Ligand binder design. Structure first.
Ligand SMILES: CC(=O)c1ccc(N2CCN(C(=O)c3ccc4c(c3)OCO4)CC2)cc1
Ligand SMILES: CC(=O)c1ccc(N2CCN(C(=O)c3ccc4c(c3)OCO4)CC2)cc1
Ligand SMILES: *Cc1c(COP(=O)(O)O)cnc(C)c1O
Ligand SMILES: *Cc1c(COP(=O)(O)O)cnc(C)c1O
Lengths: 429, 429
């Protein structure tokens, strides 16, 4: 298919994330290749190479078409594409489970594989609910979180997303009614944690779990909070006998400057979700880990099992690429790499603070954000960035990037320069 | 890892579908290769080849490691592993969307890609709910189905699963309360449809949709029903203004003897889900299709968009191998192939009718079932079949197979022989 043919098929037949059919302000851009940190996009009938500043929605941590990951896929393909995980096991699942147990926060001893982040969050909730039913406390069935969060698009996951950003006004009488604490602040304030505890105290008998994104909240607003809050959550959850669940689907595998964001606080949750960067951005895969105590309590309960089982559970191909991606990350000095990335983002974004439409500039690991004083028009921002050799996709009032770890210092500065130019244009209306 | 090491890691750290940790009656069997219709499994420390009678849970319709499908994946890998679908489109998505719109029942004009069957079901429900909210009818928010069904493991999907099979007794006060009609019978009885209609009529003002598996109910009991019931559902839904959703995640792509099971009834749903065999069993991928009317009504609604967007939406690698798989199916006389397979299953399983513990033997396309009068002990059945060179996994009182379309008559004879002998063992006590 030619690019124009693709565009025609697309406009008539393809849904995109959070999109319409037939009412799109702008056509999507045709992508025809991806290699390293670079996408090849069709612009005015001509191929152009631009930097993947979004890492293709947090996934492409090693860049596209990495030789080690390509080879891991084709090597596995030669022996076994897939087998059903009911009654069978295999080397890629065992290797990946062993790795994940080893590198995640202490005490996370069992691994449930699934095919997406949203599913992994629903598995986490199911573990928490079956846990308390295994303890004879089925009343413990609600979830508590703070505002500003995002946990996926399936209906349970939706119920703990930020009610405003998640448009819960459209889902009246449909979603489970969960417990929301106020937005967690950037700076540490003991009064916030005290109020969180006072609120949780009133609901402890009906709460299965607290579910949060640690340190960085992604889709709900690219907000950062002090890791000390996670220490307080762990303490509150321990004392009130409420499970703690960390959703690390966006924060995992080095992205915030620690291997997992929980590590910024030294905290172990009872249950943890990972996903977006798990395969290095090749294939859909997610995992939900839980403690031995949670696993044993479920297994001794009435069902005698965790009542969940995806068709493609522990897919050999996805597991094999994931093993290679995790090993590639661990086999290099990733902490220095991310520290350098963060320094590049900080240095490159500093000039934005003085722009008239910019309210905040913030960086956390390989994440850089310009917060503007008005919603960003994509019809202006996307081509403006493409004109500067960069693929950027703003959301709401945010111009942000989460670049591949393999970006050179020069590439990071090209990304930040495009971000600054987009912000400058926002202030030009 | 050696097979012994894999078993050690697996027992300590890996969840399996609907399994325990630490309380498994039997260790999983190590799988070390898969090629064509055959798995290589470790038995007594040795690699043994056995037939994949389950198609690895409906997925492996062309067998494992099909050269055409291996090739499609390898080809795409060299060009583009993945890009984000937010703001970008690409050739594999366009090619697959065009194929799917063309070969599915008439009127299904738009395609929403996701990463699993359960997610695709939640997307279908979301489409239905946003549709009626787009028509100013937010009260139309419940689902209706018949008993015996299975629609996945996320919490909305659970709510329309059979209450017994789905263990809803363990989920009191957690699941949405949906409307259930009685078990749909095997033989056509207009009285059943009239009763379904009368029940639906009473609830029409609060129902968004009817959701059913067409012709074959899979995980809920491997039950078949007359396609004429689907013709009745289409009629009822039309007259009472309730959307019709067909879950073809197990029935799709030729498995029941028609390209889609809906085709047996000559009826189109408003929304349709596909999944398990979409990539020919290589990779996680699912799709939700809907009519132009549904898409436009959602897009004109208050959201202006379908509020869903998976990270790996329309993954190039998965779409590329799916295109190859679908083209491989369509480029052959698949209808004759399935007819030969059904004939082979019938011929091979007929002798089981005389066995003292057998209550029914039924075949539908490339699906063969022996139903017994008592539970099938997995500890006896699995090695009994392995000893005869076949991988079979009974469930409850059912001994069944859904073999790869590429199985030779000799291989179907081998599979059915193993099934008959498993049933013989059940009645021996
Ligand atoms: C991938 C794989 O091997 C695999 C996947 C799933 C699997 N299952 C085996 C176990 N099972 C069920 O107990 C089941 C769950 C919910 C239901 C149901 C049956 O019918 C109505 O609602 C169905 C799921 C068994 C094996
Ligand atoms: C894969 C891809 O390109 C992609 C995927 C998702 C995507 N999104 C862009 C659109 N969006 C949202 O409207 C959103 C939904 C629910 C929320 C939320 C934000 O914050 C609190 O709860 C966040 C998801 C944008 C692009
Ligand atoms: C992206 C994301 C999810 C959802 O994952 P999908 O793969 O899109 O279903 C859940 N939680 C968080 C924190 C995420 O960033
Ligand atoms: C297997 C199945 C599902 C769920 O698919 P997953 O990929 O396991 O989430 C949903 N509906 C039907 C009819 C199925 O057979």
């Amino acid at each position: 298919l030619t690019p124009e043919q693709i565009i025609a098929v697309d406009g008539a037949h393809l849904w995109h994330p959070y999109s319409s059919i037939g009412r799109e302000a702008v056509s999507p851009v045709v992508a025809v290749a991806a290699h390293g940190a670079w996408l090849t996009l069709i612009r005015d009938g001509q191929p152009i190479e631009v930097l993947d500043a979004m890492s293709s929605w947090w996934t492409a941590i090693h860049g596209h078409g990495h030789p080690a990951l390509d080879q891991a896929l084709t090597t596995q393909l030669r022996v076994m594409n897939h087998v059903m995980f009911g009654g069978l096991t295999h080397e890629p699942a065992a290797r990946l489970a062993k790795l994940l147990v080893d590198i995640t926060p202490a005490g996370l001893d069992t691994v449930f594989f699934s095919d997406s982040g949203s599913v992994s969050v629903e598995v986490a909730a199911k573990m928490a609910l079956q846990y308390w039913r295994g303890r004879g406390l089925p009343g413990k069935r609600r979830l508590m979180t703070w505002r500003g969060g995002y946990h996926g698009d399936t209906f349970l996951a939706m119920s703990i997303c930020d009610p405003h950003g998640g448009m819960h006004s459209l889902w009246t009488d449909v979603l489970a009614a969960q417990v929301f604490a106020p937005q967690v602040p950037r700076d540490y304030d003991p009064a916030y944690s005290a109020a969180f505890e006072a609120q949780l105290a009133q609901h402890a008998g009906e709460l299965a779990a607290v579910v949060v994104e640690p340190v960085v909240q992604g889709a709900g607003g690219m907000r950062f909070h002090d890791p000390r809050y996670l220490h307080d959550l762990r303490d509150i959850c321990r004392r009130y006998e409420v499970l703690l669940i960390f959703d690390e689907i966006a924060t995992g595998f080095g992205r915030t400057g620690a291997l997992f964001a929980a590590d910024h606080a030294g905290v172990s949750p009872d249950i943890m979700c990972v996903g977006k960067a798990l395969t290095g951005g090749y294939l859909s895969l997610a995992a939900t880990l839980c403690t031995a105590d949670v696993a044993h309590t479920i297994s001794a309960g009435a069902a005698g099992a965790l009542m969940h089982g995806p068709t493609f559970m522990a897919n050999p191909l996805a597991c094999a690429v994931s093993v290679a991606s995790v090993e590639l990350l661990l086999g290099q000095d990733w902490r220095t790499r991310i520290t350098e990335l963060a320094a590049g983002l900080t240095a490159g974004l500093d000039t934005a603070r003085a722009l008239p439409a910019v309210t905040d500039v913030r960086v956390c690991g390989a994440i850089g954000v310009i917060e503007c004083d008005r919603p960003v028009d994509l019809a202006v921002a996307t081509p403006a960035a493409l004109d500067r050799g960069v693929w950027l996709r703003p959301f709401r009032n945010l111009v942000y990037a989460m670049p591949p770890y393999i970006c050179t210092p020069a590439e990071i500065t090209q990304i930040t320069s495009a971000m600054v130019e987009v912000a400058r244009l926002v202030g030009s209306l």
